[PDB]
Amino acid sequence: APQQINDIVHRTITPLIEQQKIPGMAVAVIYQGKPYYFTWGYADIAKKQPVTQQTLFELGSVSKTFTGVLGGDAIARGEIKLSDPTTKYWPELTAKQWNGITLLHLATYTAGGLPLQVPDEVKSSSDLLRFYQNWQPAWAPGTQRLYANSSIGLFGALAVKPSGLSFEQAMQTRVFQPLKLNHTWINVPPAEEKNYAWGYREGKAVHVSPGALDAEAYGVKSTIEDMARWVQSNLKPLDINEKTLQQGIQLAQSRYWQTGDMYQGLGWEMLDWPVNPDSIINGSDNKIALAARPVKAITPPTPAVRASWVHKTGATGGFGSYVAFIPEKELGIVMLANKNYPNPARVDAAWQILNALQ
Ligand SMILES: *[B]([O])([O])C1=[C][C]=C(C2=[C][C]=C(B([O])[O])[C]=[C]2)[C]=[C]1
Numbered sequence: 001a002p003q004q005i006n007d008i009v010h011r012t013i014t015p016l017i018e019q020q021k022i023p024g025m026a027v028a029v030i031y032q033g034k035p036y037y038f039t040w041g042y043a044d045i046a047k048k049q050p051v052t053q054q055t056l057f058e059l060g061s062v063s064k065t066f067t068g069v070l071g072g073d074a075i076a077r078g079e080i081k082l083s084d085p086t087t088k089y090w091p092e093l094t095a096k097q098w099n100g101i102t103l104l105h106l107a108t109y110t111a112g113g114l115p116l117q118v119p120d121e122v123k124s125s126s127d128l129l130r131f132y133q134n135w136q137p138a139w140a141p142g143t144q145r146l147y148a149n150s151s152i153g154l155f156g157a158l159a160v161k162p163s164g165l166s167f168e169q170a171m172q173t174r175v176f177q178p179l180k181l182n183h184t185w186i187n188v189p190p191a192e193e194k195n196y197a198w199g200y201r202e203g204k205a206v207h208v209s210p211g212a213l214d215a216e217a218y219g220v221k222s223t224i225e226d227m228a229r230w231v232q233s234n235l236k237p238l239d240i241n242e243k244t245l246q247q248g249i250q251l252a253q254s255r256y257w258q259t260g261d262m263y264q265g266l267g268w269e270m271l272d273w274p275v276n277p278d279s280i281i282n283g284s285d286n287k288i289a290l291a292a293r294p295v296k297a298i299t300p301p302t303p304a305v306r307a308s309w310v311h312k313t314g315a316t317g318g319f320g321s322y323v324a325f326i327p328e329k330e331l332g333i334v335m336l337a338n339k340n341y342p343n344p345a346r347v348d349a350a351w352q353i354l355n356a357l358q
Pocket residue numbers: 059060061062116117118119120149211217218313314315316
């Protein structure tokens with residue numbers, strides 16, 4: 001890799017790992033449409049297994065980008081419309097508060113205050129229905145944004161219903177397979193466990209626990225290589241052969257709502273490039289990212305803007321991931337670590353790296 005990329009990456013990541021006490025890390029920089037990989041530390045501290053380009057990391061909420069794109073693919077296929085009412089795909093959802101709540105709302109966290117987490121007690125199909133029937137909106141739909149798994153997770157499950165495929169099967173067949181993400185999983189198979197890194201929380205080795213709508217909202221595990229390939233596919237969707245997938249990727253980068261200077265896509269969040277570092281850095285901090293904010297509808301949605309900083313943070317109990325790319329610059333980065341460290345530190349480092357690369 002160019003000494004320039006090598007120097008900036010190392011100059012930035014070294015102190016990051018040291019200050020955050022990150023056990024293991026893998027980084028991919030996509031420069032002029034080509035990936036460059038870097039790895040440090042351990043995937044498994046106890047068994048002394050190093051992080052390699054084949055190490056699997058939990059993506060946490062970066063999984064929402066795969067869900068937004070899978071959903072976009074369904075839209076392009078003509079199986080669903082974001083303007084459809086949620087009840088069109090779940091007629092059993094009869095409670096009156098659902099009138100007016102569309103798939104767009106679910107996809108974008110703007111249904112009116114659906115919670116960040118689906119309650120732990122919700123673990124059954126009937127339990128899910130019950131939960132949604134009893135949920136009381138705090139706001140009218142399309143007025144406030146509240147980052148939530150119960151919102152996009154539901155969008156995810158409803159989105160694949162017409163296809164007749166299960167969510168994992170649709171994700172694999174319609175997204176993973178066509179893009180050659182052959183080491184990306186919702187459920188990691190036994191044959192691949194040897195590559196599955198342990199996450200670390202307060203010193204303990206941990207893996208994400210099962211939960212309602214986990215696949216749809218935070219359950220994908222991947223390698224730095226496949227994540228780099230994901231970034232490339234998102235940087236140049238026109239290069240994708242499967243027509244509807246190309247269209248789905250574009251739809252997920254369209255701007256549907258604006259909050260402060262951030263725009264909500266399907267899973268991906270975007271800001272106009274150039275961006276103010278402090279704006280994406282401070283904005284990624286959960287004190288802002290997880291808060292209730294008024295939103296302005298973009299009527300109609302702006303098609304994917306090539307001059308944007310497209311990104312998404314992701315976390316599980318033991319993992320911290322980040323993905324960011326600038327279509328206009330053919331530039332991107334993937335940062336996967338097996339420790340959930342502050343979002344600001346992630347964005348700060350990613351910005352130092354990409355800014356120095358143009
Ligand atoms: B929990 O009830 O233990 C629970 C479940 C899911 C989350 C969660 C997962 C992923 C993201 B994303 O931003 O990485 C946010 C929240 C939290 C708690």
